[PDB]
Design an enzyme around this catalytic site. Structure first.
Site, PDB file in Angstrom:
ATOM      1  N   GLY A 265       0.846  -1.082   0.129  1.00 39.41           N
ATOM      2  CA  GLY A 265       0.134  -0.099  -0.064  1.00 39.41           C
ATOM      3  C   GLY A 265       0.836   1.154  -0.041  1.00 39.41           C
ATOM      4  O   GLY A 265       1.871   1.316  -0.777  1.00 39.41           O
TER       5      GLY A 265
ATOM      6  N   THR B 294       2.240  -2.484  11.437  1.00 41.42           N
ATOM      7  CA  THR B 294       0.797  -2.530  11.630  1.00 41.42           C
ATOM      8  C   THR B 294       0.462  -2.117  13.048  1.00 41.42           C
ATOM      9  O   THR B 294       0.862  -2.729  13.815  1.00 41.42           O
ATOM     10  CB  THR B 294       0.306  -3.945  11.233  1.00 41.42           C
ATOM     11  OG1 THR B 294       0.984  -4.299  10.078  1.00 41.42           O
ATOM     12  CG2 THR B 294      -1.203  -3.824  10.853  1.00 41.42           C
TER      13      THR B 294
ATOM     14  N   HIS C 276       2.299   5.758  20.626  1.00 44.57           N
ATOM     15  CA  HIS C 276       1.903   7.140  20.064  1.00 44.57           C
ATOM     16  C   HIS C 276       0.974   7.422  21.124  1.00 44.57           C
ATOM     17  O   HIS C 276       0.633   6.813  22.215  1.00 44.57           O
ATOM     18  CB  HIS C 276       1.245   6.811  18.677  1.00 44.57           C
ATOM     19  CG  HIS C 276       2.321   6.127  17.845  1.00 44.57           C
ATOM     20  ND1 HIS C 276       3.227   6.885  17.356  1.00 44.57           N
ATOM     21  CD2 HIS C 276       2.114   4.992  17.332  1.00 44.57           C
ATOM     22  CE1 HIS C 276       4.039   6.154  16.591  1.00 44.57           C
ATOM     23  NE2 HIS C 276       3.453   4.985  16.373  1.00 44.57           N
TER      24      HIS C 276
HETATM   25  N1  LIG Z   1       3.768   2.559  13.399  1.00 47.11           N
HETATM   26  C1  LIG Z   1       3.093   3.750  12.916  1.00 47.11           C
HETATM   27  O1  LIG Z   1       3.320   4.603  13.588  1.00 47.11           O
HETATM   28  C2  LIG Z   1       2.577   3.536  11.738  1.00 47.11           C
HETATM   29  C3  LIG Z   1       2.374   4.692  10.798  1.00 47.11           C
HETATM   30  C4  LIG Z   1       1.571   4.533   9.623  1.00 47.11           C
HETATM   31  C5  LIG Z   1       1.058   3.331   9.426  1.00 47.11           C
HETATM   32  N2  LIG Z   1       1.025   2.380  10.156  1.00 47.11           N
HETATM   33  C6  LIG Z   1       0.159   1.190  10.166  1.00 47.11           C
HETATM   34  O2  LIG Z   1       0.575   0.231   9.124  1.00 47.11           O
HETATM   35  C7  LIG Z   1      -0.484  -0.340   8.246  1.00 47.11           C
HETATM   36  C8  LIG Z   1      -0.372  -0.037   6.749  1.00 47.11           C
HETATM   37  O3  LIG Z   1      -0.910   1.069   6.615  1.00 47.11           O
HETATM   38  P1  LIG Z   1      -0.843   1.847   4.945  1.00 47.11           P
HETATM   39  O4  LIG Z   1      -0.912   3.246   5.085  1.00 47.11           O
HETATM   40  O5  LIG Z   1       0.435   1.208   4.298  1.00 47.11           O
HETATM   41  O6  LIG Z   1      -2.016   0.978   4.606  1.00 47.11           O
HETATM   42  P2  LIG Z   1      -2.694   0.663   3.129  1.00 47.11           P
HETATM   43  O7  LIG Z   1      -4.182   0.057   3.412  1.00 47.11           O
HETATM   44  O8  LIG Z   1      -2.444   1.459   1.895  1.00 47.11           O
HETATM   45  O9  LIG Z   1      -1.748  -0.816   2.979  1.00 47.11           O
HETATM   46  C9  LIG Z   1      -2.294  -1.966   3.914  1.00 47.11           C
HETATM   47  C10 LIG Z   1      -2.062  -3.065   2.674  1.00 47.11           C
HETATM   48  O10 LIG Z   1      -2.068  -4.419   3.312  1.00 47.11           O
HETATM   49  C11 LIG Z   1      -2.511  -5.460   2.298  1.00 47.11           C
HETATM   50  N3  LIG Z   1      -2.997  -6.513   3.209  1.00 47.11           N
HETATM   51  C12 LIG Z   1      -3.943  -6.678   4.211  1.00 47.11           C
HETATM   52  N4  LIG Z   1      -3.791  -8.003   4.760  1.00 47.11           N
HETATM   53  C13 LIG Z   1      -2.831  -8.637   4.040  1.00 47.11           C
HETATM   54  C14 LIG Z   1      -2.052  -9.922   4.234  1.00 47.11           C
HETATM   55  N5  LIG Z   1      -2.782 -10.713   5.041  1.00 47.11           N
HETATM   56  N6  LIG Z   1      -1.336 -10.265   3.521  1.00 47.11           N
HETATM   57  C15 LIG Z   1      -0.768  -9.389   2.398  1.00 47.11           C
HETATM   58  N7  LIG Z   1      -1.058  -7.975   2.398  1.00 47.11           N
HETATM   59  C16 LIG Z   1      -2.099  -7.815   3.310  1.00 47.11           C
HETATM   60  C17 LIG Z   1      -3.935  -4.713   2.048  1.00 47.11           C
HETATM   61  O11 LIG Z   1      -4.421  -5.401   0.664  1.00 47.11           O
HETATM   62  C18 LIG Z   1      -3.103  -3.305   1.874  1.00 47.11           C
HETATM   63  O12 LIG Z   1      -2.530  -2.995   0.322  1.00 47.11           O
HETATM   64  C19 LIG Z   1      -1.751  -0.075   9.090  1.00 47.11           C
HETATM   65  O13 LIG Z   1      -2.041  -1.033  10.162  1.00 47.11           O
HETATM   66  C20 LIG Z   1      -1.351   1.368   9.496  1.00 47.11           C
HETATM   67  O14 LIG Z   1      -2.083   1.789  10.506  1.00 47.11           O
HETATM   68  C21 LIG Z   1       1.713   2.377  11.269  1.00 47.11           C
END
Ligand SMILES: NC(=O)c1ccc[n+]([C@@H]2O[C@H](COP(=O)([O-])OP(=O)(O)OC[C@H]3O[C@@H](n4cnc5c(N)ncnc54)[C@H](O)[C@@H]3O)[C@@H](O)[C@H]2O)c1
Ligand SMILES: NC(=O)c1ccc[n+]([C@@H]2O[C@H](COP(=O)([O-])OP(=O)(O)OC[C@H]3O[C@@H](n4cnc5c(N)ncnc54)[C@H](O)[C@@H]3O)[C@@H](O)[C@H]2O)c1
Ligand SMILES: NC(=O)c1ccc[n+]([C@@H]2O[C@H](COP(=O)([O-])OP(=O)(O)OC[C@H]3O[C@@H](n4cnc5c(N)ncnc54)[C@H](O)[C@@H]3O)[C@@H](O)[C@H]2O)c1
Ligand SMILES: NC(=O)c1ccc[n+]([C@@H]2O[C@H](COP(=O)([O-])OP(=O)(O)OC[C@H]3O[C@@H](n4cnc5c(N)ncnc54)[C@H](O)[C@@H]3O)[C@@H](O)[C@H]2O)c1
Lengths: 300, 300, 307, 306
Positions: free
Chosen positions: B13, B119, B175
């Site tokens: 993503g 995540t 956070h």
């Molecule tokens: N640590 C932090 O402060 C921080 C910062 C931002 C994002 N995040 C977290 O990271 C995660 C990803 O965020 P993002 O902005 O990339 O979102 P996004 O939805 O664009 O990316 C997530 C992707 O994971 C894929 N996915 C879901 N389940 C899957 C599985 N079982 N196997 C493979 N792929 C799978 C989805 O199809 C999607 O493309 C979220 O949980 C988000 O909240 C954490």
């Protein structure tokens, strides 16, 4: 006083944003990321998100998001990625004229690199609205095409892309005029390394490079390779490198044509286009370029 | 024979895509970009866009999109961005099974890898991955403090008009209101920020760091932050791939440290060739000791 | 008309040649390597050798070697690495007498061809030699700067990295004043990952680390047998050149002209500065302990002989 | 455990030290500078000086100095820049004899402590020094490589760029065989942004560029007065080291062992190669004109007679 270079990126979409982050990571200067008033906030959040990476990747650049062209004042380089067929051209052509009038009010001395498709005519428009000499208004096309070409030749031979060279005149797709005779691996002509069939498919896959990505993503066009191509052209100007790179340039005699923009080999330097390079072409190439110049006239 | 490092990024993503491109740019290794079978095409299209930028930016790395975990075979490092897109217990529980499903194919195909989890909530997700994996504590890590310090450092840098390079931040826990910043262990060029920024203006920078995620969410209109979070993951991958023995804040498993045990908490770590080399325990005050207890208790 | 930064490096000895090669590798600008007429050919040899490296390392920078200072015209930055080292048994006054003279002759020709440049001085003793450059240049104070603390903090961070087995990236040093007995370390503003070093390294071995920092330059001279350190010194100059050319507003220890700061006037001292596009943007004034104010008063007594 | 790559550099002189500093800066691995026991303090002094640059340039590397080959144990790559101090009355043939003996002594100690290393030789004459390293090492051919062509192409590219006033990134050279008279440039396989140089530069000026390339090592020797080039040679070495440690599959000219390639057997020769994680992956064989076969035949008659 030593002042940072200032780059304004007009269009805060996928391409403009990747371009801004690349420019900022390389410390090429301060970046003003500009979009429309209804995307002002999203543009401020992409900017602030890039800036918040700076401590970790360890670059000093200011990155701001804005819908006010006063913030682009005394920009050194402006990258126009602002986009929305003959109606589309006329819409993008309307944008180009709105943007260019604001840009040269606030930055009368800047250099303009245009990505907006069809970039052949989107650049002509900027050039005529801007009032700037031809050296200061340039478009991107050839670098992305040679970038896709080198990637395919590189997996074919199982060698570094660093040692592959492509040569492209004209535009994308059917406007593209590849010179596979000026295309090499380790300086060895590709025609000596890749059988005829596999090579013409690599040429075809380059022609169908932009669409192959549009097909895979579903929504929207490519942004990683296109952002790279703009940054290579920005770096060539800011650092006065006198790179030999294919660019969209205004012809006043070169290759027989006058008064049009076309994808030609140039020297990119601190004065923008230092030279349009004139090669001796084959009859087959001159004819394929004459067809390409017909689709550039097609978008008047 | 010398072989490249292999990095697999689960979740193609906003965050995983940006992570993959940064890792390729820095030639840290080969990248496999992994999503679900219905997104296998737009994944292959991101991977190919990125790889097509390699000739232009001058990096030798292969990037492939997959939905087949056989392609992640013999990975040195796996980075989990696999995130869901509804209650607060819904996302947690859904992300928990994703974590389980993902970890399961990972430890089959790459038995010896190190895992970095992004995540949210990272403390919960990193625990799951740790449990399903059967790997020792050193080999499973989450990202949180690096991104919080990066925000802190950005705001301090703007407040003092200095380079981000000479600003330090120091955070335990996670956070929001789980963040336990020690301003007294935060400096501009080795000078404590208490001596440089007034009480009121330093309180607001800390509050802005608590609310840093949310600020991007709000401005972005749809979706969370990626540039700075991707940057934060690459710093942790680099410390491991290059055995740098960085002192970085990381979500790690405690077994006596700070008096807590059997939890994943934000702590200072030496990150090196063996992932977490040591969890660092400082002499905390009571108002900080209590603030960490309230942080431990909020992670349940 | 976007034009490259031009950087002139005075002295094509090991420190100046190393500096030139680092500046070119980072594409910070075009480099002019300058030396005395009798060493003209060697200077062009080094420059052409570095330039022949550019296709391989893939940097676009011009490098030339010269003994003609006209080639330095309109330099944005001029780095001075000309002068002699203190030979064993040589008095401090003899070191100053000889380098004072070179600093006057060099500054004269520098400002003749680049009246608007920034000047960074390496020549020892650096508070005395940066002062001589300042007074000879007629430049305002923000434009004439010496290297000292960056190199002292680099050695300090290296020793502490070894003691704790961590990356140098996560060690902080902090030094006022000059090299050797003139150095005024603040160990209490020195950390590993922001943790005070007094809390991490016991008194005997930390004191040893401070004493090795004071002796660091002499440690490399003793080991080389033939001259002085160049790699770390060249690195320290390049960090300061970058801070200015790219207007970074780094907080770095620099040898800076005081006009009230620390209670001193009309001298160069080693102090925390903000370094940027206007050079020394600000001398940062700290609250020192009385032990610190005293050690700083002894250090001062050595630019007072140049006022 | 993720472990840093390890590089030993034999000879801690102008080229060895310059190479060590570039390897550390680029973070390609830990570095061990080895020299003779009498020059162990100078070597520790350079090693320590470089390491003290690490916090300022922002690289993590270990760099040490030693007279003891145990410190080189389990090196992934050894670079040989060792050669005897050119005394006043040293016979060309005496110098080559001394250096041939240094290569055997050095190589015996290297393969004992690093039986699995890749070795890159710089010592002149590099075709004969590299063969001596190969036969003493007992390694197969893919794991002992010489540097020659990269340095010649760097000089060529610099002079073409000066001539056309363009970036050196956009100029390419093609060179088979050794330095100087033994060099076999292919200007027909040399370009500016893909354009054959023969179409850009008149023949008299292009002939002179070639001649300056043959003479390029001696041009620096003449200007320096004592000693030979070190910045471009170090860079040339590091490009070859990087293509191996990072498995890049570069096409680069290298002094490579031939078993039939170009119709020669059991010689080291300057040839286009593919350079990767297994060292020399392929010797590339070109279709040469009879003039180029003859120039190369004459170049091989040098390699045999030294
Ligand atoms: N640590 C932090 O402060 C921080 C910062 C931002 C994002 N995040 C977290 O990271 C995660 C990803 O965020 P993002 O902005 O990339 O979102 P996004 O939805 O664009 O990316 C997530 C992707 O994971 C894929 N996915 C879901 N389940 C899957 C599985 N079982 N196997 C493979 N792929 C799978 C989805 O199809 C999607 O493309 C979220 O949980 C988000 O909240 C954490
Ligand atoms: N040159 C090439 O080879 C190449 C390759 C890829 C993309 N492109 C072209 O680049 C353009 C942008 O691509 P993208 O993926 O980034 O698009 P995008 O739609 O994601 O972003 C375009 C942005 O332009 C902005 N914009 C529109 N009108 C504006 C105005 N008046 N002022 C300021 N901003 C304005 C929009 O707000 C939008 O965010 C398209 O025309 C695309 O076809 C060309
Ligand atoms: N701050 C530190 O601890 C530190 C570190 C190392 C060196 N230094 C200083 O740097 C100086 C040079 O260091 P080095 O290792 O390169 O020594 P070096 O002897 O190799 O270089 C000095 C160069 O200055 C040149 N020079 C002398 N007079 C000149 C003039 N009028 N114009 C131009 N060039 C002139 C000499 O010809 C010589 O090439 C030392 O003398 C010392 O003062 C300071
Ligand atoms: N194109 C090329 O391949 C090319 C170009 C330039 C240099 N060179 C060659 O590289 C070699 C090194 O050149 P340099 O300028 O670095 O010379 P240098 O004299 O500065 O360094 C050579 C070092 O080798 C050391 N050494 C000698 N015998 C040794 C032994 N038995 N074990 C370990 N170390 C030993 C010496 O003590 C000396 O410090 C020379 O033979 C030179 O001709 C070849």
């Amino acid at each position: 006083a030593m002042k940072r270079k200032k780059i304004s990126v007009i269009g805060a979409g996928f391409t403009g944003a990747t371009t801004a982050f690349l420019l900022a990571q390389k410390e090429l200067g301060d970046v003003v990321l500009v979009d429309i008033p209804q995307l002002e906030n999203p543009t401020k959040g992409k900017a602030l998100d890039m800036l918040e990476a700076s401590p970790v990747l360890g670059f000093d650049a200011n990155i701001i998001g804005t819908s006010d062209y006063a913030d682009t004042a005394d920009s050194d380089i402006v990258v126009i990625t602002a986009g929305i067929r003959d109606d589309l051209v006329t819409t993008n052509q309307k944008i180009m004229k709105q943007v260019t009038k604001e840009v040269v009010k606030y930055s009368p001395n800047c250099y303009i690199i245009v990505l907006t498709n069809p970039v052949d005519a989107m650049t002509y428009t900027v050039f005529k609205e801007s009032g700037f000499p031809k050296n200061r208004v340039i478009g991107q096309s050839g670098v992305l095409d040679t970038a896709r070409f080198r990637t395919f030749v590189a997996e074919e031979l199982n060698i570094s892309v660093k040692d592959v060279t492509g040569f492209v005149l004209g535009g994308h797709g059917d406007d593209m005029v590849p010179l596979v005779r000026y295309s090499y691996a380790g300086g060895i002509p590709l025609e000596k390394l890749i059988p005829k069939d596999r090579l013409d498919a690599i040429v075809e896959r380059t022609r169908k490079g932009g669409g192959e990505i549009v097909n895979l993503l579903g929504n929207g066009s490519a942004y990683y390779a296109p952002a790279a191509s703009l940054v290579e052209m920005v770096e060539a100007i800011l650092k006065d490198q006198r790179r030999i790179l294919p660019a969209i340039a205004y012809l006043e005699g070169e290759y027989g044509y006058e008064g049009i923009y076309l994808g030609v080999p140039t020297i990119l330097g601190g004065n923008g286009i230092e030279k349009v390079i004139e090669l001796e072409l084959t009859e087959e190439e001159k004819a394929a370029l004459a067809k390409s110049v017909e689709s550039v006239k097609n978008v008047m």
